Amino acid sequence: NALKADFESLRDQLQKAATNAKFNGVSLADGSTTKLSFLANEDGSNFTVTAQTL
Amino acid sequence: SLTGIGLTATSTFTDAATAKTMIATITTSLQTATNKLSSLGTSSVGLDTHLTFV
Protein backbone atom coordinates (compact mmCIF):
# COMPACT_ATOMS: atom_id res chain seq x y z
CA ASN A 1 0.00 0.00 0.00
CA ALA A 2 2.89 2.38 0.69
CA LEU A 3 4.49 1.80 -2.71
CA LYS A 4 1.06 2.12 -4.34
CA ALA A 5 0.48 5.50 -2.69
CA ASP A 6 3.98 6.57 -3.76
CA PHE A 7 3.24 5.52 -7.35
CA GLU A 8 -0.04 7.45 -7.30
CA SER A 9 1.61 10.59 -5.92
CA LEU A 10 4.39 10.36 -8.51
CA ARG A 11 1.78 9.97 -11.26
CA ASP A 12 0.01 13.12 -10.10
CA GLN A 13 3.38 14.90 -9.95
CA LEU A 14 4.10 13.82 -13.53
CA GLN A 15 0.71 15.10 -14.67
CA LYS A 16 1.29 18.48 -13.04
CA ALA A 17 4.83 18.73 -14.45
CA ALA A 18 3.41 17.97 -17.90
CA THR A 19 0.63 20.55 -17.62
CA ASN A 20 3.08 23.23 -16.41
CA ALA A 21 5.32 22.78 -19.48
CA LYS A 22 4.40 25.94 -21.37
CA PHE A 23 6.17 29.14 -22.40
CA ASN A 24 4.12 32.35 -22.79
CA GLY A 25 0.95 30.26 -22.94
CA VAL A 26 2.11 27.96 -25.75
CA SER A 27 3.69 24.55 -25.40
CA LEU A 28 5.09 21.60 -27.32
CA ALA A 29 4.58 19.12 -24.46
CA ASP A 30 1.04 19.73 -23.15
CA GLY A 31 -0.47 18.30 -26.35
CA SER A 32 -2.66 21.32 -27.14
CA THR A 33 -1.96 22.59 -30.67
CA THR A 34 -0.86 19.89 -33.10
CA LYS A 35 2.19 21.86 -34.28
CA LEU A 36 3.93 25.23 -34.12
CA SER A 37 4.76 27.00 -37.40
CA PHE A 38 7.82 29.25 -37.20
CA LEU A 39 8.96 31.77 -39.78
CA ALA A 40 11.63 30.75 -42.28
CA ASN A 41 11.76 33.25 -45.18
CA GLU A 42 10.94 36.73 -46.43
CA ASP A 43 7.94 35.14 -48.17
CA GLY A 44 6.53 33.82 -44.89
CA SER A 45 7.38 30.15 -45.40
CA ASN A 46 6.81 28.16 -42.21
CA PHE A 47 9.31 26.07 -40.22
CA THR A 48 7.07 23.23 -39.09
CA VAL A 49 7.64 21.72 -35.64
CA THR A 50 5.13 19.00 -34.74
CA ALA A 51 4.01 18.94 -31.11
CA GLN A 52 5.43 16.20 -28.89
CA THR A 53 2.81 15.49 -26.23
CA LEU A 54 4.18 14.54 -22.81
CA SER B 1 -3.35 56.14 -51.60
CA LEU B 2 -4.25 52.82 -50.00
CA THR B 3 -6.89 52.09 -52.64
CA GLY B 4 -4.34 52.95 -55.33
CA ILE B 5 -1.86 50.40 -53.95
CA GLY B 6 -4.58 47.77 -53.49
CA LEU B 7 -5.18 48.05 -49.74
CA THR B 8 -8.53 49.11 -48.34
CA ALA B 9 -9.00 51.71 -45.62
CA THR B 10 -10.11 48.88 -43.30
CA SER B 11 -7.59 46.23 -44.43
CA THR B 12 -6.33 44.08 -41.56
CA PHE B 13 -5.63 40.48 -40.60
CA THR B 14 -7.60 38.64 -37.92
CA ASP B 15 -5.79 35.28 -37.60
CA ALA B 16 -2.44 33.75 -38.48
CA ALA B 17 -3.61 32.53 -41.90
CA THR B 18 -4.93 35.99 -42.77
CA ALA B 19 -1.61 37.46 -41.63
CA LYS B 20 0.24 34.99 -43.86
CA THR B 21 -1.88 36.11 -46.81
CA MET B 22 -1.29 39.72 -45.76
CA ILE B 23 2.46 39.18 -46.09
CA ALA B 24 2.07 38.69 -49.85
CA THR B 25 -0.55 41.44 -49.97
CA ILE B 26 1.75 44.03 -48.38
CA THR B 27 4.61 42.74 -50.55
CA THR B 28 2.68 43.34 -53.77
CA SER B 29 1.62 46.74 -52.46
CA LEU B 30 5.22 47.67 -51.68
CA GLN B 31 6.27 46.54 -55.16
CA THR B 32 3.67 48.65 -56.95
CA ALA B 33 4.56 51.59 -54.69
CA THR B 34 8.25 51.38 -55.59
CA ASN B 35 7.33 51.15 -59.27
CA LYS B 36 5.21 54.29 -58.96
CA LEU B 37 7.96 56.27 -57.21
CA SER B 38 10.43 55.13 -59.88
CA SER B 39 8.12 56.38 -62.62
CA LEU B 40 7.72 59.71 -60.81
CA GLY B 41 11.49 60.05 -60.52
CA THR B 42 11.97 59.33 -64.22
CA SER B 43 9.36 61.97 -65.01
CA SER B 44 11.19 64.49 -62.81
CA VAL B 45 14.41 63.67 -64.67
CA GLY B 46 12.65 64.34 -67.96
CA LEU B 47 11.46 67.65 -66.52
CA ASP B 48 15.04 68.60 -65.63
CA THR B 49 16.46 67.66 -69.04
CA HIS B 50 13.67 69.53 -70.81
CA LEU B 51 14.38 72.55 -68.61
CA THR B 52 18.04 72.52 -69.68
CA PHE B 53 16.97 72.16 -73.31
CA VAL B 54 14.52 75.05 -72.99
CA distance B25 to A9: 54
Any B CB within 8 A of A44 CB:
yes
Any A CB within 8 A of B16 CB:
yes
Give the contacts of A25 (CB within 8 A, at least 6 positions apart): none
CA B10 to the chain's CA centroid:
17
CA distance A49 to A29: 12
Experimental method: cryo-EM
Contacts 24+ apart (CB under 8 A), B22-27: B23/A43, B23/A44, B24/A43, B24/A44, B27/A43
CA distance B40 to B33: 11
Cα dihedral: B5, B8, B13, B18 (round 10): -60
Contact A44 B23 (CB under 8 A): yes
- Nearest chain A Cα distance for residue B13, angstroms: 15
Any B CB within 8 A of A33 CB:
no
Rounded to 5 degrees, what angle do the CA atoms A48, A54, A47 make? 5
